[PDB]
Amino acid sequence: IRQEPYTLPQGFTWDALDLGDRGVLKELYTLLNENYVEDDDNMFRFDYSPEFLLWALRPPGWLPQWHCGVRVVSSRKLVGFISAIPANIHIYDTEKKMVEINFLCVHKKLRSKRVAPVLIREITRRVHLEGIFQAVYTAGVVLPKPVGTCRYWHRSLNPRKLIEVKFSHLSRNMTMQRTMKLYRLPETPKTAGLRPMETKDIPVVHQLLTRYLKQFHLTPVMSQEEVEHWFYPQENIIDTFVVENANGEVTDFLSFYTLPSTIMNHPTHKSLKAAYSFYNVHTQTPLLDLMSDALVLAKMKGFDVFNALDLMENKTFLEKLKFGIGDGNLQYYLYNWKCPSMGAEKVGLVLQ
Amino acid sequence: GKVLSKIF
Ligand SMILES: CC(C)(COP(=O)(O)OP(=O)(O)O)[C@@H](O)C(=O)NCCC(=O)NCCS
Ligand SMILES: *C(=O)CCCCCCCCCCCCC
C-alpha cells in the first residue's frame, strides 16, 4: 500500500478537515451548499446543515484522515471533499468491517479536470492503511453490478408549496385546493404510547433494530454506542419516536432525518424542508400505522415533503399512504466484494 | 442523500 498521498494537479493540495473546528466545518458546509448534488433540472440543491455533517461524519470510530479535503494552494479555498466512516456491514452470510463512502464533491469550477478520480484513489489508500478492504456506497450514476437499485418515493406534506416550486405538479383534472385536501393529514399521531426516544430507550432500540434487520441481505450491524449516535434525537438533524406499550415497554420505533434543499429560482420560496425515512421497526404496531404517524409528526415539524426509498418493507405502505414515486434512482455498490444482486426489499441499509 | 429526486 502506497504510503504517500497520490499526486494532485499542480496548484492543489490535500488537507484533512478538522470538523471540530467551527470555521472548517462551515467551509465544508459552504462547499456542499454551493456544489453538492442537484436534481436533474438544477432547481434544487442539497443543503446539509453544519450540525448534520458533524453528526454524519463523526460517528463512533471516525478518523480524521478520512475527512479528506482538497484546497487551492494559493488561496486555501476548499474545492474538493470525500469521506469514509467505519461501519460493520452484514452482506448475506458475512458480517465485515467496512467503510461507508459519502459526500464526494468537487467545486463546479474544478470539474472535468480529473480531481474526483484522485479523491477516490486517495480515500481508498487511506482506508487500506487501516486494514479495511471493502466499502459500501450509493450513487445515482449507473456503475457496473450494483448490489441493489432503489427508487425514491415522496409524500406531499405541503402540496401547494411543492407545486409552486415545481417539486410536484397537479395531476390530471386536479386543482390546487383539491390537491391540498387530498394530502391533508391528521393533526396528532394516533398510536397510543408514541413519544420521542430517550436515553433509557437505547438498549431496547438496539435490540429491536438488531432483530428486525436480520431479515434483509444488506444491513448495518450497530453497537449500542452506534445506536445512541444514529438515533438519539437531535433537533433539526435526527428524529426518533418510540412506541411504549401499556406496560411501559418499547415495542416499535420510527425515525427520520432532516435534509432540506435550496430552491434556486423561485421569487418567494428559498428552501424545501424534506424528511427522510431512516429506520422503522414494528413488532406490535402495524407498519402502516407507524408511518402514518411519521407523516403526521413531520407535518407538525414543518416539513414540506416526506421522502422514502422502496427498500426494506416500505413497498407495503408507500402507495396506501399516498407516496408518489420520484424520478430518482439510487444504486447501492459494494467495493471489492462480489455477491448476487438483490431486490430493493432485501436492502436494509440507509446512508445519510 | 445521493440523489435529489422529485415527484415523477
Ligand atoms: C461527481 C463529481 C465529484 C465528479 O467530479 P469531476 O472532477 O467533474 O469528475 P471527472 O469527470 O473529472 O473524473 C462532480 O461532478 C460533483 O461534485 N458533483 C456534485 C456532487 C455529486 O454528485 N456526488 C455524487 C458522486 S457519486
Ligand atoms: C458518494 O459520494 C459516494 C462516491 C463513491 C465513489 C467511489 C468509491 C469507491 C470505494 C472507495 C473506498 C474503498 C476502500 C476499501
Residue A248: phi and psi, rounded to 5, are: 85, 15
Which H helix or E strand runs over A176? helix A176-182
Compute the nearest-CA separation of A350 from chain B (Å). 9
Q: What is the largest CA-CA distance in chain A?
A: 66
The protein residue whose alpha carbon is closest to atom 12 in ligand 2 is A124
Tally of structural domains, chain A: 2
Kindly list the distances between the CA atom of residue A201 and the CA atoms of A193, A204, A241, A253, in Å, as whole numbers in the listed order: 13, 6, 10, 10
Resolution number, Å: 2.0
Q: Do residue A184 and residue A61 come from a single domain?
A: no
**Sign of the C-alpha dihedral computed for residues A178, A44, A101 and A202 taken in this order:** negative
Check: CB of residue A297 under 8 Å from CB of residue A241.
Answer: yes
Q: Do residue A114 and residue A138 come from a single domain?
A: no
Q: Do residue A120 and residue A143 come from a single domain?
A: no
Check: CB of residue A14 under 8 Å from CB of residue A122.
Answer: yes
Q: Do residue A78 and residue A50 come from a single domain?
A: yes
Q: How many CB atoms lie within 10 A of CB A186?
A: 12
Experimental technique used to determine this entry:
X-ray
Q: Do residue A128 and residue A233 come from a single domain?
A: no
The string of DSSP letters for A60-110 reads: TT--GGGEEEEEETTT--EEEEEEEEEEEEEETTEEEEEEEEEEEEE-GGG
Beta-bridged to residue A100, according to DSSP, are A85, A136
Question: Residues lining ligand 2, CB < 6 A?
Answer: A 99, 101-104, 120, 123-124, 127, 132-135, 137, 139, 335; B 2
Residue showing cell 444504486: A331
| Residue to substitute in A104, A108, A109, A118 for testing ligand 1 pocket (most ligand atoms within 8 angstroms of CB) | A104
Q: How many CB atoms lie within 10 A of CB A36?
A: 21
Q: Do residue A124 and residue A175 come from a single domain?
A: no
Kindly list the distances between the CA atom of residue A51 and the CA atoms of A1, A8, A77, A88, A290, in Å, as whole numbers in the listed order: 34, 30, 21, 24, 27
- Asked if A44 and B3 come within 8 Å (Cβ–Cβ), the reply is no
Instruction: Tell me how far apart the alpha carbons of residues A264 and A275 are, in angstroms, rounded to a whole number.
Output: 19
Pairing of strands A274-277, A250-258: antiparallel
Q: Do residue A56 and residue A124 come from a single domain?
A: yes
DSSP class of residue A108?
Answer: G
Q: Residue A87 is placed in which grid cell?
A: 461501519
Beta-bridged to residue A12, according to DSSP, are A72
Domain boundary among A98, A133, A168: A133
Domain that holds residue A64: 1-133
The crossing angle, in degrees rounded to 10, of helices A224-231 and A202-213 is 100
Q: Do residue A199 and residue A214 come from a single domain?
A: yes
Q: Do residue A331 and residue A191 come from a single domain?
A: yes
Instruction: Tell me how far apart the alpha carbons of residues A220 and A89 are, in angstroms, rounded to a whole number.
Output: 5
DSSP class of residue A239?
Answer: E
Pairing of strands A261-263, A324-335: unpaired
Q: What angle do CA A122, A125, A127 make, to 5 degrees?
A: 110
Q: What separation, in Å, do the N-terminal and C-terminal C-alpha atoms of chain B show?
A: 17
DSSP class of residue A285?
Answer: S
- Asked if A261 and B7 come within 8 Å (Cβ–Cβ), the reply is no
Pairing of strands A305-309, A274-277: parallel
Q: Residue A157 half-sphere exposure, CB side, CA atoms within 13 Å? A: 23
Q: Do residue A122 and residue A189 come from a single domain?
A: no
Which H helix or E strand runs over A30? helix A22-35
Pairing of strands A148-156, A305-309: antiparallel
| Residue to substitute in A102, A106, A143 for testing ligand 1 pocket (most ligand atoms within 8 angstroms of CB) | A106
Collapse the DSSP code of A126 into the 3-class scheme (helix H, G, I; strand E, B; otherwise coil) and give the result.
Answer: helix
Which residues of B, range 1-8, sit inside 8 Å of A by Cβ?
1-8
DSSP class of residue A265?
Answer: S
| A136: nearest Cα among A210, A65, A69, A219 | A219
Beta-bridged to residue A152, according to DSSP, are A309
Q: Do residue A236 and residue A99 come from a single domain?
A: no
Q: Do residue A202 and residue A282 come from a single domain?
A: yes
Compute the nearest-CA separation of B6 from chain A (Å). 5
Instruction: Tell me how far apart the alpha carbons of residues A313 and A317 are, in angstroms, rounded to a whole number.
Output: 8
In total, chain A counts a number of residues equal to 352
The string of DSSP letters for A179-199 reads: HHHHT---SS--STTEEE--G
